[PDB]
Curated annotation (Swiss-Prot), chain A:
The lineage of its organism: Bacteria, Pseudomonadati, Pseudomonadota, Gammaproteobacteria, Pseudomonadales. This is Multidrug resistance protein MexA. The gene is mexA. The periplasmic linker component of the MexAB-OprM efflux system that confers multidrug resistance. Functions as the major efflux pump for n-hexane and p-xylene efflux. Has been shown in one study to be involved in the active efflux of the autoinducer N-(3-oxododecanoyl) homoserine lactone, thereby playing an indirect role in quorum-sensing; but has been shown in another study not to be involved in efflux of this autoinducer. Over-expression of the pump increases antibiotic and solvent efflux capacities. Implicated in the secretion of the siderophore pyoverdine. The chain holds residues 126 to 177 of 383 of the full protein. Component of the MexAB-OprM multidrug efflux complex, composed of six MexA subunits forming a hexameric tube, binding to a MexB trimer, which interact with the trimeric OprM outer membrane channel protein. OprM is thought to not directly contact MexB; instead, MexA joins MexB and OprM by forming a funnel-like hexamer anchored to the inner membrane. MexA may initially form a hexameric ring complex with MexB prior to OprM, then OprM undergoes a conformational change as it contacts MexA, allowing the periplasmic gate to open. Disruption phenotype: Disruption of MexA, MexB and OprM significantly reduces active efflux of N-(3-oxododecanoyl) homoserine lactone/3-oxo-C12-HSL/PAI-1, but not N-butyryl homoserine lactone/C4-HSL/PAI-2. Induction: By growth under severe iron limitation.
Swiss-Prot record, chain B:
Disruption phenotype: Disruption of MexA, MexB and OprM significantly reduces active efflux of N-(3-oxododecanoyl) homoserine lactone/3-oxo-C12-HSL/PAI-1, but not N-butyryl homoserine lactone/C4-HSL/PAI-2. Component of the MexAB-OprM multidrug efflux complex, composed of six MexA subunits forming a hexameric tube, binding to a MexB trimer, which interact with the trimeric OprM outer membrane channel protein. The OprM homotrimer forms a 135 Angstroms-long pore. It consists of a beta-barrel, which is probably inserted in the outer membrane, and an alpha-barrel formed by alpha-helices which probably spans the periplasm. In the ground state the periplasmic end is closed, while the outer membrane end opening is 6-8 Angstroms in diameter. Induction: By growth under severe iron limitation. This is Outer membrane protein OprM. It comes from Pseudomonas aeruginosa (strain ATCC 15692 / DSM 22644 / CIP 104116 / JCM 14847 / LMG 12228 / 1C / PRS 101 / PAO1). The lineage of its organism: Bacteria, Pseudomonadati, Pseudomonadota, Gammaproteobacteria, Pseudomonadales. It comes from the Bacteria. The chain holds residues 387 to 439 of 485 of the full protein. It is found in: Cell outer membrane.
Length: 52, 53
């Protein structure tokens, strides 16, 4: 109903999409510290045990 | 003669004043419907209300 401007909405939507991209780029690292098998097959021995 | 002059002029003075009143009333209801969502506080709503008054 045009209470605020059509430019201030564009600024708020840009800030929202930048913050969502920051959340996604910050959960990419949280997925990186859950280290996933990039392939599927036989796995060898653990050369680095837990704690190192 | 100046009664006729007032008859000739108040019919647009009061109409421009009614347009002022409709403009400030739409301003106040638009400030109310941007307060009711939660963007701006109640003090600017009271400022719009005292301007309408």
């Amino acid at each position: 109903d045009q209470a605020v401007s059509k430019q201030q909405y564009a600024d708020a939507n840009a800030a929202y999409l930048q913050s969502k991209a920051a959340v996604e780029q910050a959960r990419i690292n949280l997925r990186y510290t859950k280290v996933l098998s990039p392939i599927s097959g036989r796995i060898g021995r653990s050369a680095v045990t837990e704690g190192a | 003669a100046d009664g006729l002059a007032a008859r000739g002029t108040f019919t647009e003075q009061l109409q421009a004043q009614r347009d002022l009143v409709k403009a400030s009333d739409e301003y106040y209801q638009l400030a109310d419907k941007r307060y009711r969502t939660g963007v701006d506080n109640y003090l600017t709503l009271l400022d719009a209300q005292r301007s309408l008054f």
